[PDB]
């Protein structure tokens, strides 16, 4: 009795998921597909968390005239892997429910992925996914029907793409799957579009990693439209790599804003080893800017376990002791290397001096050159003058250095009173928020 | 290093570069995009060892991009090479996109009744007619008529009515279905008259099939001519129905004129 | 008849867009 009960609830959930998708697909267009398919996908994720009986339920899913209730009785009668994957099509063709057949093909793959064999059997699941992909290829290319499969089964193809990524993660990588995704991008170029292409492209960047940054640059050129970001999590995924691309490309200032936007869009728990990686990129890039971000604002516990290094490193950046920074680099070099942001830490070792100058610029309106030398422990006043030229850098108040008695005049912007001097400054800020009044137009359109 | 191959000025290297670009267009879309200005010079250069192949790789620069018009420009450079890829996954869509460019250009030419119609690209027209020939090979009347009125050319339409030569539904009331969805009467009348002529070409011209010319064309002489043939063959039984059908289906005017032609 | 169906669906959109303008125009008149 205890082992059958999980099977009964899962089978009932799958039957409800199939019935809802099929009924909507039959009536209307656009509302026909993906109206509850995303809900069905989260229900499928719950089914993945909740666990062979599922393959027997899959067997002979459809024959001709609808007999799904009779089929459910037949699944109970079986109670009372590779062959099972192809068994329903072999036993009897559905004779209808083409969007359902792709969903039916997807249902056995999830248990095969759940098994996580990391073996040829998992590759056989990939072969079953390829057969499902062929049905997806013909959904509009050969079938002249509406894109119910493109609207819904493309998400199923995206899950299959992630399973394909799992097989490649077990091995090395498949650029050919990305090329197949490029063919899907041509399908996206057609009447209907999907943003799954960017996520696989992010994996392509990841595979090249340090060895090639061209793929990231190619990604920047590849960037197109898809501002719908219906997944939203997908937009965060695009943002996380896009921010990574800028951070490696030395555009740290743009990257931190992108990472913050990416950090905000995390509806999924991302409890362990997940959101922490997104947090890690934001903190390092802000440290690279030289502004010091304390970890107290967020401090996720899993972020904390990986943050024992960075937290000491943040203390090291505040401290003037290079040896403390060296101890942190040697002791905590591991894990940061796993993150892949270790190269950013290597550039950060030089950046420690910049943090002090930024503190000086906020603290002192007109600091003495010799005083700057004492504050940053410059060996000589001329070295401090050289540092002052570096201090002007970009995005800081004009030094306007006299080069004589004035020394580091570092004059701050004046008349910054949100008055005439900032009249553009405090009106432009309103324009952006007032521009967000678009939400009233967008939601009004939905009814 | 496709750019590096272009940097050395060797004609054999020029062929090597286009072949290498053809091999991995997807892997380095940006590299072709960075060198697209160099590629465009080579594609339009007669001196280039394979300008047609350079045009084929130029379409590959636009493989990621969606510009059909650029592919039509590439078809001009490719010449036969664009036609040579009669069926090729992605290119088949791009040639179809060129067919869409061709139909809109042809519809614009049909719109002009004063002549001076802009010339269709011969290479673009060649891919369109070749795909149109594939539709005749398929034997589907619908596929054959698929570019028949898109080109707005009666000569292509005569080939489409011929199709695989079965001509069963097309040699009957296919005109009525086309007339219902037809947008322009001026192009429609040419289609209507030619289709009734093909019906006349059949050994028996159905009076119902030739009725559309009798009423929609409303040519009094043409109805008099078919009526004269009925008198000549003395087929009074067939003649009786068409005359009554004409009176019910259409107004007098031309009907009165054929009565005048018949009386004298 | 895919070529004919393409014309038929195109006609349906053209008619709907033509009608869509009328509703907005009358609605603006109602506001006055």
């Amino acid at each position: 009795p205890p082992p059958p009960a999980p099977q009964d609830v899962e089978m009932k959930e799958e039957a409800a998921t199939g019935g809802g998708s099929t009924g909507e697909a039959d009536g209307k267009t656009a509302a026909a597909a993906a109206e509850h398919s995303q809900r069905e996908l989260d229900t499928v994720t719950l089914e993945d968390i909740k666990e062979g009986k599922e393959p027997r339920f899959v067997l002979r899913a459809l024959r001709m005239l609808p007999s799904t209730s009779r089929r459910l009785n037949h699944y109970v009668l079986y109670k009372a892997l590779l062959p099972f994957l192809e068994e329903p099509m072999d036993t009897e063709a559905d004779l209808q429910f083409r969007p359902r057949t792709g969903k039916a093909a997807s249902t056995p793959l999830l248990p095969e992925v759940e098994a996580y064999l990391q073996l040829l059997v998992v590759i056989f699941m990939m072969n079953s996914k390829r057969y499902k992909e062929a049905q997806k290829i013909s959904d509009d290319l050969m079938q002249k029907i509406s894109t119910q499969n493109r609207r819904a089964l493309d998400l199923v193809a995206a899950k299959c793409y992630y399973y394909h990524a799992r097989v490649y993660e077990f091995l090395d990588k498949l650029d050919v799957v990305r090329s197949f995704l490029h063919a899907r991008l041509r399908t996206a170029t057609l009447r209907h579009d999907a943003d799954g292409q960017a996520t696989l492209l992010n994996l392509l960047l990841r595979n090249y990693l340090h060895y090639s940054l061209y793929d990231q640059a190619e990604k920047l050129v590849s960037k197109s439209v898809f501002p719908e970001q219906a997944n939203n999590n997908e937009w965060a995924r695009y943002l996380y790599y896009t921010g990574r691309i800028k951070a490696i490309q030395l555009e740290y200032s743009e990257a931190r804003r992108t990472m913050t936007n990416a950090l905000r869009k995390a509806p999924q728990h991302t409890a362990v080893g997940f959101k922490q990686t997104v947090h890690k990129l934001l903190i390092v890039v802000e440290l690279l800017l030289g502004e010091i971000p304390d970890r107290l604002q967020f401090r996720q516990p899993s972020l904390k376990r990986s943050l024992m290094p960075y937290f000491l490193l943040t203390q090291a950046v505040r401290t003037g002791n290079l040896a403390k920074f060296n101890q942190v680099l040697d002791q905590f070099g591991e894990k940061f290397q796993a993150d892949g942001t270790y190269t950013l830490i290597i550039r950060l070792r030089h950046n420690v001096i910049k943090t002090g100058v930024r503190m000086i610029s906020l603290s002192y309106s007109r600091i003495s050159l010799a005083d700057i030398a004492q504050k940053l422990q410059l060996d000589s006043p001329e070295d401090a003058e050289f540092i002052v030229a570096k201090a002007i850098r970009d995005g800081v108040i004009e030094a306007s250095i006299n080069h004589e008695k004035g020394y580091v005049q570092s004059k701050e912007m004046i008349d910054i009173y949100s008055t005439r001097e900032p009249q553009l400054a405090f009106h432009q800020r309103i324009s952006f928020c007032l521009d967000i009044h678009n939400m009233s137009v967008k939601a009004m359109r939905f009814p | 290093g496709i750019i590096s191959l272009l940097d050395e000025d060797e004609p054999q290297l020029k062929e090597f570069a286009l072949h290498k670009l053809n091999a991995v267009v997807n892997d380095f879309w940006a590299e072709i995009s960075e060198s697209v200005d160099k590629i465009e010079v080579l594609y339009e250069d007669e001196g280039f060892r394979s300008r047609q192949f350079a045009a084929l790789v130029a379409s590959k620069v636009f493989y990621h991009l969606g510009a059909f018009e650029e592919s039509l420009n590439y078809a001009l450079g490719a010449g036969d090479l664009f036609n040579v890829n009669d069926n090729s996954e992605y290119v088949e869509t791009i040639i179809a996109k060129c067919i869409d460019h061709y139909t809109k250009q042809c519809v614009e030419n049909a719109d002009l009744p004063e002549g001076e119609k802009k010339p269709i690209d011969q290479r673009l027209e060649g891919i369109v007619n070749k795909m149109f020939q594939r539709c005749l090979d398929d034997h589907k009347y619908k596929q054959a008529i698929g570019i028949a009125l898109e080109t707005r050319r009666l000569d292509v339409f005569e080939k489409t009515i011929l199709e695989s030569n079965d001509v069963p539904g097309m040699l009957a009331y296919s005109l009525k279905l086309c007339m219902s969805l037809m947008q322009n009467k001026q192009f429609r009348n040419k289609v209507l008259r030619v289709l009734v002529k093909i019906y006349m070409n059949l050994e028996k011209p159905d009076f119902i099939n030739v009725c559309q010319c009798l009423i929609f064309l409303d040519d009094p002489q043409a109805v008099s001519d078919i009526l004269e043939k009925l008198v000549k063959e003395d087929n009074l039984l067939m003649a009786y129905q068409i005359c009554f059908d004409l009176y019910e289906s259409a107004s007098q005017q031309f009907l009165s004129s054929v009565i005048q032609n018949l009386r004298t | 008849d895919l070529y004919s169906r393409y014309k038929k669906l195109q006609q349906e959109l053209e008619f709907l867009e033509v009608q869509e303008e009328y509703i907005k125009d009358e609605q603006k008149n109602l506001k006055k």
């Binding site: 002249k144 009447r191 | 570019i147 | 109602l30």
Partner: peptide, 28 residues
């Protein structure tokens, strides 16, 4: 595919009828 996938593009334009229903409700 040119005359069998372009009709599919007109299916994309069918969503405008849903907007027409929303505006029709406003007219009422």
């Amino acid at each position: 595919y040119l005359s069998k996938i372009e009709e599919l593009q007109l299916i994309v334009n069918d969503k405008s009828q849903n907007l027409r229903r929303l505006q029709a409700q406003r007219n009422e």
